[PDB]
Write a protein that binds this ligand. Structure first.
Ligand code: NA
Length: 93
């Protein structure tokens, strides 16, 4: 599944997609999402507990920062699809 490239450890497409070139500050909710993407990557995609945290952190961002989410969240569906694929792979062992 090509969504999986988004949490391949070297991949920066998701964090680029939530950057503001006009240099608007990221919410704490968005900074926790970006940090959780990098933490999952750091192990080479081995932690289901970290992957869960990323999924919860995306829900918190969507709930708490609607305007930032709607504006910066264009790659969220694809990242959530990648999360599910790595969940399947870790469930399979
Ligand atoms: Na989800």
């Amino acid at each position: 599944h090509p969504s999986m490239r988004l949490l391949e450890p070297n991949n920066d497409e998701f964090v680029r997609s939530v950057a503001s070139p006009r240099l608007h500050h990221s919410s704490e909710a968005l900074r926790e999402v970006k940090h959780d993407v990098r933490q999952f990557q750091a192990s080479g995609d081995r932690s289901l507990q970290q992957l869960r945290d990323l999924e919860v952190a995306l829900n918190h961002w969507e709930a708490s920062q609607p305007r930032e989410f709607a504006k910066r969240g264009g790659m969220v569906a694809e990242l959530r699809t990648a999360i599910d694929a790595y969940k399947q792979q870790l469930h399979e062992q």
